[PDB]
């Protein structure tokens, strides 16, 4: 439905708490495939399986290979703004 902008807060050493799939080499968006219980995405809320990640902290993810999205997501620090839309 609507595009949402959601903030995730975590410690440097924590993971985001999401699994992603898709990517340019598969012809599909970066899609959230799992939200892991008790981890930052689950605690903060607003991110769900089936969301496409359009951008993370202002960085466009719409034409990234899978591993490029993994890299950009893995480089996040403590505050992370997600731009997502359920597809």
């Amino acid at each position: 439905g609507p595009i949402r902008k959601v903030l995730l807060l975590k410690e440097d050493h924590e993971g985001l708490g999401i699994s992603i799939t898709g990517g340019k080499e598969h012809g599909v968006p970066i899609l959230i495939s799992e939200i892991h219980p008790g981890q930052p995405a689950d605690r903060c809320g607003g991110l769900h399986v089936g969301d496409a990640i359009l951008a993370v902290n202002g960085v466009n993810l719409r034409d990234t290979k899978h591993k490029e999205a993994v890299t950009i997501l893995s480089q996040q620090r403590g505050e992370i703004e997600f731009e997502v839309v359920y597809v």
Binding site: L16, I18, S19, I20, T21, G23, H26, V70
Partner: peptide, 9 residues
């Protein structure tokens, strides 16, 4: 193959 990568971050 056709299978998609899945990665936890």
């Amino acid at each position: 193959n056709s299978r998609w990568q899945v990665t936890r971050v």
